[PDB]
Amino acid sequence: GGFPNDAKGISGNGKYYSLGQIEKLYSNQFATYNNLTVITSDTHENSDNFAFCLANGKRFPSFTDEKPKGIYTLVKDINKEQYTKLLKENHKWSSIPNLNQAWDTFSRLSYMYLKDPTDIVKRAWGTDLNTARTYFHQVIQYEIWRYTDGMRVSSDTNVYIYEKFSPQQKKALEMIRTDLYNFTVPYENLEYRFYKPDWVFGLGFQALATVRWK
Numbered sequence: 001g002g003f004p005n006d007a008k009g010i011s012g013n014g015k016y017y018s019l020g021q022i023e024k025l026y027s028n029q030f031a032t033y034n035n036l037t038v039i040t041s042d043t044h045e046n047s048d049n050f051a052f053c054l055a056n057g058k059r060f061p062s063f064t065d066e067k068p069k070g071i072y073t074l075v076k077d078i079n080k081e082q083y084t085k086l087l088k089e090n091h092k093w094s095s096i097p098n099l100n101q102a103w104d105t106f107s108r109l110s111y112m113y114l115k116d117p118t119d120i121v122k123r124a125w126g127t128d129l130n131t132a133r134t135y136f137h138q139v140i141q142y143e144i145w146r147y148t149d150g151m152r153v154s155s156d157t158n159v160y161i162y163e164k165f166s167p168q169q170k171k172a173l174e175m176i177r178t179d180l181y182n183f184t185v186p187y188e189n190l191e192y193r194f195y196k197p198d199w200v201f202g203l204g205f206q207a208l209a210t211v212r213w214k
Contacts, residue, residue: 001122002115003133005212007038009045016040016047016195017068018061018208021141027065033134036208038195039063041071048193048210052110052141055090055206056149061197070205072195079192083107083209086194087148090207097150105147107192109176110211111185113140118179124172135166139173189214 019025019034035050044066053060061070075082080103087102096102112120113136125132142161145151153161153173165173191212197205 001117001119003050003113003136005049005114005210007046007049007212009040009043009047011040011047011074012042014073015198016072016074017044017063018051018070018072018195020062021053021060021138023060023062024064033138035134035137036061036210038072038208038210041068047074048212050113050137051195051208051210052106052113052144053206054087054106054144054148054209055094056145056151057094058090058204058206059200061205061208071198072205072208073198075194075196077191078194078209083192083194086196086207087209090197090204091148094149096148098147102147105180106144106209107185107187107211108180108183109140109144110192110209111190112176112179113137114190114211114213117183118175120172120175120179123175124168131168135169136172139165139169139176143173143176 016038019037021036022031022033024031036053037046038048038051039046083103121132121136142151142153151158155162191214193210195208197207
């Protein structure tokens with residue numbers, strides 16, 4: 001179950017790029033859903049197979065035509081206090097709703113993508129893991145934003161997003177909402193990671209965070 005994060009790229013200069021959420025890899029092609037994969041700035045090796053954006057109101061990273069927008073440094077093996085501090089720093093001009101709980105929801109939701117402890121993917125997509133790999137990322141991402149940014153998506157709230165969801169995504173969202181608190185997260189066996197965006201003039205970039213097995 002879940003989607004492994006077995007990437008091992010480490011950048012020689014400590015800087016990383018992301019392929020983005022829905023972005024073109026090459027400007028003459030149709031955009032693809034890229035799971036916010038994070039790559040080394042030097043070798044373009046994945047460092048983390050997926051990641052999640054932590055600030056829906058900031059700039060999103062991309063790597064179209066191999067030109068980075070949004071450059072990151074990595075904080076390894078984060079805990080509740082570090083996550084909370086870094087998340088808050090990335091939201092200087094917005095308040096995070098139920099901030100106390102922000103680590104709990106992020107760490108649970110990202111783990112549900114990594115491991116899927118309650119078998120949401122089997123129930124929503126069956127054996128179609130290729131579709132689920134991106135379509136489940138997207139619903140997990142929106143639910144992360146419910147908690148980072150108050151972006152609750154439903155048939156009567158943020159309808160412009162909801163109506164774009166596939167039927168399987170809609171089912172998965174209901175399962176996520178039912179199952180969120182109904183498992184224990186095995187923190188001692190996991191490495192959570194934070195990607196801190198380098199400063200730029202103006203509205204900055206969203207931070208990213210992700211998880212892998214140790």
